Amino acid sequence: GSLLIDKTVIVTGASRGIGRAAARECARQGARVVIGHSGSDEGRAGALSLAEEIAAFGGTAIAVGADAADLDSGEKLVAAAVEAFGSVDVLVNNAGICPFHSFLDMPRELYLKTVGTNLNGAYFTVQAAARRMKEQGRGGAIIAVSSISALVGGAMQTHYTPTKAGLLSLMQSCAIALGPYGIRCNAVLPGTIATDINKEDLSDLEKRERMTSRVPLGRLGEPDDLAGPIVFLASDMARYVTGASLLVDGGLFVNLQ
Amino acid sequence: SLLIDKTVIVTGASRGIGRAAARECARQGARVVIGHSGSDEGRAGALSLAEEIAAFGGTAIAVGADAADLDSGEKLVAAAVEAFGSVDVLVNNAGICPFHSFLDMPRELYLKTVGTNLNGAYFTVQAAARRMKEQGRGGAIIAVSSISALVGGAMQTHYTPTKAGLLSLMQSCAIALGPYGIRCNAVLPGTIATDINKEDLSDLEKRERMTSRVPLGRLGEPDDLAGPIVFLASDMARYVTGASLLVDGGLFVNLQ
Amino acid sequence: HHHHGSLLIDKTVIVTGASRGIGRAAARECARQGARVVIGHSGSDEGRAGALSLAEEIAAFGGTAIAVGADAADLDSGEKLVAAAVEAFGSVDVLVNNAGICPFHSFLDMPRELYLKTVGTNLNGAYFTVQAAARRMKEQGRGGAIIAVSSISALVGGAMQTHYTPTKAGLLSLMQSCAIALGPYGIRCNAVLPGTIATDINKEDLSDLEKRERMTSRVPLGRLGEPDDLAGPIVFLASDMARYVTGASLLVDGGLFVNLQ
Amino acid sequence: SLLIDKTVIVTGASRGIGRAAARECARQGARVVIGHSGSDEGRAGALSLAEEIAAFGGTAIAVGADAADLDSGEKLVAAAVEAFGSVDVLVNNAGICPFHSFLDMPRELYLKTVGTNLNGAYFTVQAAARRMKEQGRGGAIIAVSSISALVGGAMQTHYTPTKAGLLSLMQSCAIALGPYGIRCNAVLPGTIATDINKEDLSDLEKRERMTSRVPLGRLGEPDDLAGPIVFLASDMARYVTGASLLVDGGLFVNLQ
Hints:
The structure is a homotetramer. By secondary structure, chain A is an alpha/beta fold. Chain A has helices at 17-28, 41-56, 73-85, 108-136, 161-178, 202-213, 224-234; strands at 8-11, 32-37, 60-65, 90-93, 140-145, 183-190, 244-248. Chains in contact: A-B, A-C, A-D, B-C, B-D, C-D. At the A-D interface, α4 and α5 of A face α4 and α5 of D. It is classed as oxidoreductase. Keywords: L-Rhamnose metabolism, NADP-dependentdehydrogenase, SDR protein family, oxidoreductase. It forms a tetrameric assembly.
């Protein structure tokens, strides 16, 4: 594919799941990809194996550790991208956590780590990438991976849903601030995205059937289901799209019981 | 080549967004049915687009089918099936916005706006969706709605409910038609420079005022909707249904 | 005296579809708040009987009301209701548009006649009832309030409601556009969005105790709504408590919309 | 008598919307905890409000409790319980909007905005809700958010996410606290003339431009939010939770 030929794409949280699938598809569309990961041993291992898979089909990618909760990570990722590839053209902000926990006994540290990682870290990663895009003067695209939970509630996600709605709101306000520099800012809202079914347990499979019944398309999402929408929003197919959000949920949001 | 071997029906495709979407689908490999109003101007515009498409190697036919006539849906599907053997994508785009104040709104003006923009769309969607279910191969439906689906307009009290109604139709059809692999979504164009508003935008002081409200710094053009429509019609959007997508250069978020 | 409120004292309120359900409860509470109420009904035998029994109850607790038959699908009904209100009470100050139908039906075999009756009753008839009321409010020069009773279905889909959800979304959009058009005349326009409300309509879905238990378990507040649960929000939007509220919508659903499952 | 004998905690109540909401709660029979920042101006405003309320026969106390200090929620609850025996309503209103461009936003300013507007709200809601659950009599929580929860602002990249986050917090808390009869809702004020925007509103030309964008034809006053807040706090809203209410004179829908 050639939707992102000669663009440098940073993807945060890209060692597994949606970010992994997005980074891969960006590389398949001709981009040179900075695979950001958490800096953990599993994160590094997944980032490097993705880099290998990309190298195998002729792509170009590097892996960069950068804990999203560390607010210095944005400039570290931009610096690594500019050092290796000379530019930053697309940011896919995807790193996040969702430690389910009840509201009335939520500890401060868990709440603050969730906001810190999902929203504050995103803020300054977007800021670092957008600064570089403005300095280049060639435009850019920023995509925040948020969630259907940006639009509705979850009882075990009182600390989590505000960060997802926060991300949507950040893209709306950045769209105004960065529009004069040709930088488009949008959000994708994944619904229920499943992990590999061959690795699930029997109990995990029984919950899969109930959640699947809730989706009009008749199946849970896969990480690759988010790659097309992310690459669309990063590309010239979306040349007039900014300040927008896009549900990628198989109809889950509209399917009121 | 996102739509190779797909039959695409575009309603109201002789001018504006519909014309650009029909041409782009054809460039992506689709066989395109160019639906128009049946008027003399509609027929001429659809004819010229069909010739343009044929000139770059694409395939298209032109079909008159007044969107206000509830028989038009089956006529378009029958023409598509006769010419190309299938219906795989519907881009519902025919619509009118006769600006008029609310307190003196004529009943027949209101009824023609709802009849064209919403009622005609309902039964065009129904006719295409039936064929798609019958084929058993899935499909995609894209309603061209508007930013006006989300906010108000004092001279559009008859019009904004049809745009919001179209979005809602896509949400409910996504549920009804999801088990058949038929995805239903809406695009919400912002301020698009077309033939309808060309005289209003001739006022270049007005144009600069309208332009200053768009963060991307320009008004839209019909090709700005072509990419998002083809995306929603394609396998890039295989898990997208019941969704809406603003295509407005940031207009909606830019609270003045 | 009956511990009547005064939020709507000296105001004339037209309620369409007021013989039963949400409309009946709204009309009753407006009268408890001091309003003179036009109890609009469909003209059917059942509608007329329900409107008369409400008028008897209101009269007995010291309120003021009249019953007026006015089929919402007849686009002349808006002017009929306004004329009755002006003749009986001298003004029109609040419109609560509540008349509507939801004949559940699948999409692919939806008949034209059923679809067109649903749009005609729920949206077209509301449009010209709002128009007739708003013209009288403008002519009076004392402002007013319009409340459309829409539905949570204005925000989400329903497979057996492809003909119905667009009319509910359309009503919300109508309030947004009318808020702009009528704001200069002091007329505020808002929509209320009820969730699952146990009314006579969904009598037979709720007849199934197992279905009813599942529907109740989806509401965070833990119960289905009652028509009286909509009376307070409607009266609020009609009153000076909401003097700066226009172009707005209000979910009244016990948390159903936010409770993603 | 919408709130007779209820204990209402209002944060940020020395001025503006919070001050008017605290006053109206007391006019409805509530005993009011006037939360303020602890600054000299916060202390003076809270005292004058407490005296205002006392002068018309109400009951109130003032409590300094910086919303950025995450201990403040339990400080307010403890003061409410000692003075008045219960907590029944929380109006979360404390917030800041230090306008600043995005690309040079300092970390300290961003973190103080999130910390005050969202993090402090979270743990104030948590403290109030714990006490409401222990009492077993239900309760009401109202977050004062903004129209900016729905749209963007170039000089508010740090601010609008906190306002949208407040709305989302009420949505999730409505689910978690529903079983305990605790309703959670947000109000979204439009352009409200307060001490914050006071200097910008002395420019007569700009005030006219901002007024012309409101369909009701005037800017809001703090009293304009009091009615909606007391409504959401009361039995008039007994089936309302997880909901949001624009209080903006039509500003949001009035697309240019």
